[PDB]
Amino acid sequence: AADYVLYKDATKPVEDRVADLLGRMTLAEKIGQMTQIERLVATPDVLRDNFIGSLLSGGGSVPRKGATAKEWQDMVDGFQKACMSTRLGIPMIYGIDAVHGQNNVYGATIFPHNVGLGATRDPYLVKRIGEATALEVRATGIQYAFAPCIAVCRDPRWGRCYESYSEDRRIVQSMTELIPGLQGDVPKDFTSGMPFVAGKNKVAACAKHFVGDGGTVDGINENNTIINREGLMNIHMPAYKNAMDKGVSTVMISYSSWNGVKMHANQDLVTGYLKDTLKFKGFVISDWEGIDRITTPAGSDYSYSVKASILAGLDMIMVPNKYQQFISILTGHVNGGVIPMSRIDDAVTRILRVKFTMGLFENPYADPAMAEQLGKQEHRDLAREAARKSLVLLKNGKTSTDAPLLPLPKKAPKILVAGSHADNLGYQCGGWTIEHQGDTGRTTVGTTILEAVKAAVDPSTVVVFAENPDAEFVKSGGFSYAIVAVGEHPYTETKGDNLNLTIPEPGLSTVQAVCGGVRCATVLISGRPVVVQPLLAASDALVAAWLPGSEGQGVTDALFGDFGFTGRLPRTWFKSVDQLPMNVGDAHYDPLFRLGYGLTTNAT
Ligand SMILES: *[C]O[C@@]1(*)[C](S[C]2O[C]([C][O])[C]([O])[C]([O])[C]2[O])[C]([O])[C]([O])[C]([C][O])O1*
Numbered sequence: 001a002a003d004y005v006l007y008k009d010a011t012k013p014v015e016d017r018v019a020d021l022l023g024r025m026t027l028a029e030k031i032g033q034m035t036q037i038e039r040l041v042a043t044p045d046v047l048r049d050n051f052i053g054s055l056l057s058g059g060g061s062v063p064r065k066g067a068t069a070k071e072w073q074d075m076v077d078g079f080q081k082a083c084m085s086t087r088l089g090i091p092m093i094y095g096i097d098a099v100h101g102q103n104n105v106y107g108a109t110i111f112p113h114n115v116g117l118g119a120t121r122d123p124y125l126v127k128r129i130g131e132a133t134a135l136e137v138r139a140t141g142i143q144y145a146f147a148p149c150i151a152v153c154r155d156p157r158w159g160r161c162y163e164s165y166s167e168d169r170r171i172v173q174s175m176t177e178l179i180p181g182l183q184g185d186v187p188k189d190f191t192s193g194m195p196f197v198a199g200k201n202k203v204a205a206c207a208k209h210f211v212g213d214g215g216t217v218d219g220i221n222e223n224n225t226i227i228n229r230e231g232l233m234n235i236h237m238p239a240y241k242n243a244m245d246k247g248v249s250t251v252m253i254s255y256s257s258w259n260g261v262k263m264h265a266n267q268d269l270v271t272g273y274l275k276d277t278l279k280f281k282g283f284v285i286s287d288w289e290g291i292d293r294i295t296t297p298a299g300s301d302y303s304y305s306v307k308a309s310i311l312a313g314l315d316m317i318m319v320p321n322k323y324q325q326f327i328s329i330l331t332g333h334v335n336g337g338v339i340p341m342s343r344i345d346d347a348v349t350r351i352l353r354v355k356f357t358m359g360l361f362e363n364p365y366a367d368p369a370m371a372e373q374l375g376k377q378e379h380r381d382l383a384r385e386a387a388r389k390s391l392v393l394l395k396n397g398k399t400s401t402d403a404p405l406l407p408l409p410k411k412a413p414k415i416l417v418a419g420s421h422a423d424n425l426g427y428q429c430g431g432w433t434i435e436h437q438g439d440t441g442r443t444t445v446g447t448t449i450l451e452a453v454k455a456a457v458d459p460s461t462v463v464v465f466a467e468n469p470d471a472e473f474v475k476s477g478g479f480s481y482a483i484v485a486v487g488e489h490p491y492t493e494t495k496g497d498n499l500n501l502t503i504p505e506p507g508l509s510t511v512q513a514v515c516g517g518v519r520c521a522t523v524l525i526s527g528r529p530v531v532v533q534p535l536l537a538a539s540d541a542l543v544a545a546w547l548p549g550s551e552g553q554g555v556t557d558a559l560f561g562d563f564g565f566t567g568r569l570p571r572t573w574f575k576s577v578d579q580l581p582m583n584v585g586d587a588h589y590d591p592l593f594r595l596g597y598g599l600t601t602n603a604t
């Protein structure tokens with residue numbers, strides 16, 4: 001008709017649609033696009049009245065505990081219906097931390113955390129995990145995952161070291177294959193730095209957190225990274241360029257500083273480097289209250305937080321709560337000439353560019369036929385393959401002349417499974433699982449190590465579980481062997497920062513009691529290397545299983561010799577925390593186990 005609106009026409013080029021919509025928008029509509037809010041503060045009126053551009057779920061932000069995929073779809077669609085009811089009908093994009101599967105969601109497949117994936121040296125595996133993750137995210141109606149974390153963790157004292165594929169940038173680079181898994185492969189023609197998402201069965205990705213988040217002093221989370229530009233560019237930056245080449249749709253800025261300059265206020269790096277040198281054309285998003293934390297104390301000059309961040313080049317702000325204040329302050333700054341319209345128009349161009357590119361104007365609503373992708377057995381099979389491939393065998397015999405303990409026989413009259421982490425699904429998933437910090441016990445659908453043992457063994461094999469047996473119990477039990485699992489409790493972000501890296505008790509005391517009685521395979525669950533000499537000294541065999549996720553049969557696949565051990569350390573294992581930071585090229589490089597170490601077995 002003469003009711004045609006070019007931006008609404010799916011046959012037009014993305015840039016023509018962006019320009020056409022931009023040209024129609026009020027300042028309020030523009031600033032609304034730049035605002036991302038928590039679902040916890042969203043209502044239909046809020047979304048409509050403030051022209052909100054995006055919503056998220058922070059860790060543990062769920063419609064309710066145990067919600068079905070359809071409950072999530074219906075929640076997301078309710079918010080979208082409100083956004084579509086605005087004058088311009090701009091759909092919101094909904095983001096979430098799907099960082100090892102769609103991990104906030106009950107019944108979602110939970111993949112190994114990134115450090116384990118590093119150990120696989122299998123970028124195609126990681127791609128396929130991207131692919132599966134996209135499907136389980138879209139099962140829930142969600143279009144945007146805040147992944148991959150391409151931090152290069154340089155000090156394992158950092159509470160997010162498990163979110164880093166490796167201390168070696170080349171491994172992190174190789175695992176940027178998660179991006180085309182989540183988003184789809186970019187076409188032959190593609191210009192590096194353009195955003196890309198294939199369509200409604202894929203999700204927008206997010207390379208995070210730009211830049212040097214894994215380089216902070218003593219691994220303190222959100223702190224300062226002191227390194228010259230050459231080291232920044234040589235360690236922390238390279239994977240951002242691989243992300244551009246694969247069309248990552250968004251980049252999230254780090255809470256960390258670089259030589260004292262807050263990333264969230266760093267115009268030279270965000271605009272000068274990311275946008276102007278790497279030619280990034282997607283949208284730059286803040287971290288959660290990232291702009292607030294520009295100042296000390298945080299939140300003490302919000303006016304300045306908004307100015308500094310938007311002038312630095314950020315496009316979308318993860319507020320995520322005080323949207324009225326954010327919108328009011330940015331409006332005032334624009335009205336006062338402090339922030340030019342050209343900056344607003346750039347941020348909104350980028351946001352709209354991602355939304356049009358990914359098909360969000362053509363498919364703003366969830367597909368109910370996708371709900372059944374959640375926790376699909378094919379995806380669990382993949383997680384089980386990844387878990388097994390992630391495992392790094394550190395010891396398999398106390399002496400060079402002992403019979404190797406692994407692989408264990410599936411037939412034996414009686415076996416012991418022991419330890420705090422042998423039958424605890426939450427602990428084997430770690431942080432960013434159901435809750436932000438993760439949790440203990442049977443928090444979702446999966447298979448614990450105990451469950452996996454019982455599923456694996458010959459029917460004549462009696463399996464005895466004892467969480468923390470004493471030495472006499474073990475000696476008296478008539479056991480052929482034991483599998484004993486211990487390690488770190490779940491943690492996320494600052495809560496995981498840890499200067500001593502010794503596992504909690506009872507962990508070591510149980511290993512000692514078990515292994516003193518019967519030959520034992522110790523399965524160490526951790527997000528990083530931890531003090532391990534005492535555990536090694538006690539154990540016949542020891543496996544670094546990292547945080548292998550929901551599919552504990554990946555552990556038993558290698559214990560019982562269905563597959564051989566192939567994992568190799570993607571990080572240095574230190575002798576002592578007083579050595580840290582210590583990386584695979586220093587000077588005082590005196591590792592317990594060097595990067596790349598890993599014993600192997602053959603399938604039986
Ligand atoms: C769940 O947010 C936490 C933040 S951290 C922040 O969260 C965003 C969104 O979940 C992630 O994508 C990002 O990788 C991460 O750095 C803490 O710093 C907050 O203090 C906490 C308070 O509720 O929430």
Ligand SMILES: *[C@@H]1O[C@H](CO)[C@@H](O)[C@H](O)[C@H]1NC(C)=O
Nearest residue numbers: 220222223224256257260296
């Ligand atoms: C680093 O942490 C110290 C100690 O908590 C804190 O006082 C300082 O502000 C932090 N620095 C940065 C840049 O975040």
Ligand SMILES: *[C@@H]1O[C@H](CO)[C@@H](O)[C@H](O)[C@H]1NC(C)=O
Nearest residue numbers: 404406407564600601602603
């Ligand atoms: C495993 O296979 C390799 C190569 O074929 C061989 O050299 C090694 O001795 C094998 N180990 C065992 C226990 O069979």
